[PDB]
């Protein structure tokens, strides 16, 4: 009785947010982007096939130098590749083979991993000993670790399966702040290019935008009907696309605070495992788990291309910082560098 | 070639890394990956007591020159849909069922008894899309406590239609047939049912005999003989 009348406020507040949708109901993204020149038919070919894992790859991350790559598979190894050659720069044996995420530092000196072991292990690459050692074990989560992303050598945002995210400190080993408010298990996250905000998505079909210094949710986005498991920012930073299990991608805007465009097709079921943007955000690369990635037009909602070529489902995906190539790693033992 | 000495030594290092990865994969392919699943109160830790925080516990053990890795994942308490596909490719699933909890209920969630929850979990993991062809080593623990409890309380508390007496053997066969009939994939999957006793080197003997059979049958499927 005491809470229910609060619900009488609260859903009404949501209706006010819906009334805020009437503040931004003048037009859609398709109406503004009419009579524009399309990107056209895209035939980008695989160039490298990074063949050194022996189980299914769950994550990859490019380097900021756009040549190094990192990958984590469901065997106990995490391999750092040269992409120009096909050279394994490193191979790190892991304490637990159940890793679902990995990250590559912008400085390039550290890598991260995590998964069912609830620990974001940080490994120091550049060292005087010559071999990669465990720099810092970041324990403290209770759910399964789902995403990790670096800010610098000391800050890292980890989203786990305990419906919370956390920003940590490498030297202290403890959480600087905890982001709370999702009701389902948190699956993905993405930082802005100016790293002031990051938007993260969970299994409750809600994408929440957080500030790294405030520690609280700024904006909340809804419109999916299944577990959101992929989020990538626009390179401008004022918008972000997401992908979930309903085989639809959605482009939300931070300023409009609503969904702009929906990317879907009639013959596509078996939804998205990973999304990314190209340079200038014109193409949306979505890795669907009917074994292939699709190139959608971010302004025309048209399927420009198909990146089929993986024998199993494209778990992980990523575009280089200069946009030279896109890597897709799948649930066979293989990464592929499409260009 | 157009490598020069630095990139030639770099591809030599990558070849050494390839060799170490191949040796590590051959060492890891000698292990048998098993998954412990259950309601939690089934006494599967007692199974850990019979074979010999983090969300996954690995119970490495050996029996007759064969090494088993047993993955207890029931302490995760998360949504099982988003991380059970990590375990697609285990050799078998060791589902543990408490026989003595046929009449015991849990009133915290929805007041229903624990055996219907265990049967719901068995229907969820047997008919999963990832465990289409991974056989189940079903274990029925606490048989003596179940016998001492069915000496007083009959089986009709759990099952509304049980046309049998209070004999331990007939009720155990009825429970085994009820758990086996949740298999909708009987052509591509078998269920190995055992009653957990206090005799040493017999539950692990059942696991070893079940795992050799599923390895033989999976090899006969993979080589085209089946």
């Amino acid at each position, epitope marked *: 009785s005491e809470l229910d009348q609060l619900r009488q406020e609260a859903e009404q507040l949501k209706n006010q947010i819906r009334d805020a949708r009437k503040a931004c109901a003048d037009a859609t993204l398709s109406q503004i982007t009419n009579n524009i020149d399309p990107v056209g038919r895209i035939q980008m070919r695989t160039r490298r096939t990074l063949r050194g894992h022996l189980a299914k790859i769950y994550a990859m991350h490019w380097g900021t130098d756009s040549r190094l790559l990192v990958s984590a598979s469901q065997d106990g190894k995490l391999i750092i590749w040269d992409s120009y050659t096909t050279n394994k720069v490193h191979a790190i044996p892991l304490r637990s083979s159940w890793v679902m995420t990995c990250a590559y530092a912008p400085s390039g000196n550290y890598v991260a991993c995590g998964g069912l072991d609830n620990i974001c292990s940080i490994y120091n690459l550049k060292t005087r000993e010559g071999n990669v050692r465990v720099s810092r074990e970041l324990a403290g989560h209770t759910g399964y670790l789902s995403c990790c992303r670096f800010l610098d050598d000391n800050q890292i945002v980890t989203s786990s399966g305990d419906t919370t995210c956390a920003l940590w400190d490498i030297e202290t080993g403890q959480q600087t702040t905890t982001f709370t408010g999702h009701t389902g298990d948190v699956m993905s996250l993405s930082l802005a290019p100016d790293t002031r905000l990051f938007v993260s998505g969970a299994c409750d079909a809600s994408a929440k935008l957080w500030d790294v210094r405030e520690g609280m949710c700024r904006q909340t986005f809804t419109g999916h009907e299944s577990d959101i498991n992929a989020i990538c920012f626009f390179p401008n930073g004022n918008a972000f696309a997401t992908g979930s299990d309903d085989a639809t991608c959605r482009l939300f805007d931070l300023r409009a605070d609503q969904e702009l465009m929906t990317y879907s097709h009639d013959n596509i079921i078996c939804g998205i495992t990973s999304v990314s943007f190209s340079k200038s955000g014109r193409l949306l690369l979505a890795g669907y788990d009917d074994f292939n990635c699709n190139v959608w037009d971010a302004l025309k909602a048209d399927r420009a291309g198909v990146l089929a070529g993986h024998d199993n489902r494209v778990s992980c995906l990523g575009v280089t910082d200069d946009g030279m190539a896109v890597a897709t790693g799948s649930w066979d033992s293989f990464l592929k560098i499409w260009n | 070639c157009t490598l020069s000495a630095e990139d030639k*030594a770099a591809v*030599e290092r990558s070849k*050494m890394i390839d060799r170490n990865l191949r040796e590590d994969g051959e060492k890891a392919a000698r292990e048998v990956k098993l998954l412990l699943l259950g309601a939690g109160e089934s006494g599967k830790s007692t199974i850990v007591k019979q074979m010999k925080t983090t969300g996954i516990v690995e119970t490495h053990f050996t029996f007759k020159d064969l090494h088993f890795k047993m993955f207890d994942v029931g302490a995760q308490r998360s949504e099982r849909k988003k991380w059970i596909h990590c375990f697609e490719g285990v050799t078998a699933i060791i589902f543990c069922v408490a026989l003595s909890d046929y009449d015991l209920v849990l009133a915290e969630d929805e007041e229903m008894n624990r055996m219907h929850e265990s049967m719901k979990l068995f229907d969820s993991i047997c008919n999963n899309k990832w465990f289409t062809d991974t056989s189940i080593i079903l274990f029925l623990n606490k048989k003596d406590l179940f016998e001492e409890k069915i000496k007083k309380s009959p089986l009709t508390i759990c099952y509304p239609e049980y046309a049998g007496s209070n004999t331990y053997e007939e009720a155990a066969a009825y429970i085994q047939c009820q758990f086996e009939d949740l298999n909708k994939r009987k052509d591509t999957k078998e269920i190995y049912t055992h009653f957990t006793c206090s005799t040493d080197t017999k539950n692990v003997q059942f696991v070893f005999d079940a795992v050799t059979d599923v390895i033989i049958k999976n090899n006969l499927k993979d080589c085209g003989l089946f």
Partner: single-chain antibody, 235 residues
Framework: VQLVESGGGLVQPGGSRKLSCSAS????????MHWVRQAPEKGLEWVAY????????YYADTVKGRFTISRDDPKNTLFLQMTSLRSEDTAMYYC??????????????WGQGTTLTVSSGGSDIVMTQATSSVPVTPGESVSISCRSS???????????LYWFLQRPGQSPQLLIY???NLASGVPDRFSGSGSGTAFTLTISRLEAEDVGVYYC?????????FGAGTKLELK
């Protein structure tokens, strides 16, 4: 990270001598090993090289047919079997570790050295240094130029030139690897530049620890040839 040599001393010409370089504090089996000798009042010269896991063994012109280099990875010790020594082998042998991947820093550590003395009885790249002794002053900018007979630029964009500083009484220390990258422990005042065949090493705000001999070494293809040796002296 230690590289301690032993077994050196005075030997007869034509005799046999073995040098054992003990490595500790780092992974020995993942590091390619080199032998660099240095005669008194001379420069550095590469002798022999064995890679990680003994995959590749190289020898120089005066080394092939006479020497034998091997490693013991469980023992973490580098060996050098020398047969039929001559008067030109009287030099200070340095045990050098090296690693090779993308972004690595090869020749990043040198041993303390051992003394070998012998009593009395080619389509290569030649490193050219204009002046072997430049009198410098502290607080100014110092420019050191080295040349090569062949262009060190390759198809991958890497220009394989190195800079080594050998302080008196101390092992040589790597300063700049691949002409533009600062090594570990080297301060930010050191810089390098070059274009294909012409090279420029710039030292700004020279201090008391920058005194020593400067060497330029190529790494385009074996055999590895060091420079003549430029020594910077105060006043």
């Amino acid at each position: 990270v230690q590289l301690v040599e032993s077994g050196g001393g005075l030997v007869q010409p034509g005799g046999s001598r073995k040098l054992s370089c003990s490595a500790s504090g780092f992974a020995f089996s993942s590091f390619g090993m080199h032998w660099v000798r240095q005669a008194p009042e001379k420069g550095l010269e590469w002798v022999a090289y064995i890679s990680s896991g003994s995959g590749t063994i190289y020898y120089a012109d005066t080394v092939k047919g006479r020497f034998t280099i091997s490693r013991d990875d469980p023992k973490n010790t580098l060996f050098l079997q020398m047969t039929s020594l001559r008067s030109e082998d009287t030099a200070m042998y340095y045990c050098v570790r090296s690693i090779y991947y993308y972004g690595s820093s090869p020749f990043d550590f040198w041993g303390q050295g051992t003394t070998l003395t012998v009593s009395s009885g080619g389509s290569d790249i030649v490193m050219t240094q204009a002046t072997s002794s430049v009198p410098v002053t502290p607080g100014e900018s110092v420019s050191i130029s080295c040349r090569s007979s062949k262009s060190l630029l390759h198809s991958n964009g890497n220009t394989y030139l190195y800079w080594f500083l050998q302080r008196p009484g101390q092992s040589p220390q790597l300063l700049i690897y691949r002409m533009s990258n600062l090594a570990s422990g080297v301060p930010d005042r050191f810089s390098g530049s070059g274009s294909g065949t012409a090279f420029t090493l710039t030292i700004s705000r020279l201090e008391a620890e920058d005194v020593g001999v400067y060497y330029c070494m190529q790494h385009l293809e074996y055999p590895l040839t060091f420079g003549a040796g430029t020594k910077l002296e105060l006043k």
